[PDB]
Amino acid sequence: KNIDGYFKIYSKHTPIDLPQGFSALEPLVDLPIGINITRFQTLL
Amino acid sequence: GVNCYFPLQSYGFRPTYGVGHQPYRVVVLSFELLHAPATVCGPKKSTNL
């Protein structure tokens, strides 16, 4: 997410398509960079 | 050669030289502020609980 000039990353690693179990993502990182993001990719 | 020169030239620093010709290291600190959130803040000392 990137809303108020900060870039936030939440995450969770859960053991095992997608199961019906419920799990909330905990906040990991809240960066202070203030760039504009509108596109993204993945890195292999 | 004539009309041909190597642009860099040395300072020839040597101890028996006066104050004018002596190495003076310079550190130009600058402060950059952009629209991104600030990340380099200042110790912010506190009070006992």
Q: Is B34 on the interface with A (CB under 8 A)?
A: yes
- At residue A11, φ and ψ (nearest 5 deg) are -160, 165
Contact assessment for residue A9 and residue A28, using Cβ atoms and an 8 Å cutoff: yes
Distance of CA B2 to the CA centre of its chain: 36
Contact assessment for residue A7 and residue A1, using Cβ atoms and an 8 Å cutoff: yes
CB atoms within 10 A of CB B39: 10
The residue length of chain A stands at 44
The residues that bridge with A9 in the sheet, in sequence order, are A29
Q: Is A5 on the interface with B (CB under 8 A)?
A: yes
Query: How many Å apart are CA A31 and CA A38, to the nearest integer?
Result: 17
Closest to A32 (Cα-Cα) out of B17, B42, B35, B29: B35
Question: What tokens does A6 get?
Answer: 């900060």
Q: Look up residue A40 and give its amino acid.
A: F
Mutating which of B35, B40, B41 best tests the A interface, going by the most A Cβ atoms within 10 A? B35
- Render A23-44 in DSSP notation, one character per residue: -PPEEEEEE-------------
Method: cryo-EM
| A5/B37 touch (CB, cutoff 8 Å), yes or no | yes
